[PDB]
Each structure stands twice: as structure tokens, then as C-alpha cells.
Amino acid sequence: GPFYLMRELPGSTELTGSTNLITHYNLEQAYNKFCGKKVKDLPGMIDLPGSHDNSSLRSLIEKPPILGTMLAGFRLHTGPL
């Protein structure tokens, strides 16, 4: 019977999985740009702007990121050979 049945009815909610997985936060454009970039890197841009990159240097930079001008000018004389 109706009594002691259907303890409660939930109602309507928005937060649900949807076919538009991309628009959950409205980034359907970020995913499109990601797919376009995949169909086409930072290291490449750095090697194009300059020369190349390394390994110990990257580790030192990561560790650093985690952590008398006249005399300096004159001190130049090291006989640079």
C-alpha cells in the first residue's frame, strides 16, 4: 500500500554525467585546442628561440624553484683564455 512505501522522492538534480563531457566546465574549446595540438612542444620552442636544453641543469632549476658593482666590473681580468 502507499503507507510504508517510497520512503522519499529525490527530485531533479543538475550534477550528472552528460554526453557533453567537455562542457561540464564549458572548456569545449580547450579540448578542441588540445586535439588540434596533438594532431600537430615547449622544448621545441626553446630550441628554436635559442639552441637546446639539458638534464642536470633542469634538475638544478627545479631545485632552485623549490627554494660593489665597480669591483665586480673590474674583477673581469681573469686573463680569459
Which chain residues interact with another protein by CB under 8 A?
A: 5-6, 9, 15-19, 21-22, 24-25, 27, 30-31, 33-34, 37-38, 41-43, 45-46, 49-50, 53-54, 57-62, 64-67, 69, 72-81
> Shortest gap between Cβ of 57 and another protein (angstroms)?
4
Nearer to another protein, 11 or 73 (CB): 73
> Shortest gap between Cβ of 12 and another protein (angstroms)?
14
Q: Where are the alpha helices (DSSP H) in the chain?
A: 28-39, 42-47, 56-66, 69-74
**DSSP character for 6?**
-
Residues 6+ apart with CB under 8 A from 24: 18
What is the C-alpha to C-alpha distance for residues 33 and 76, in angstroms, rounded to an integer?
A: 50
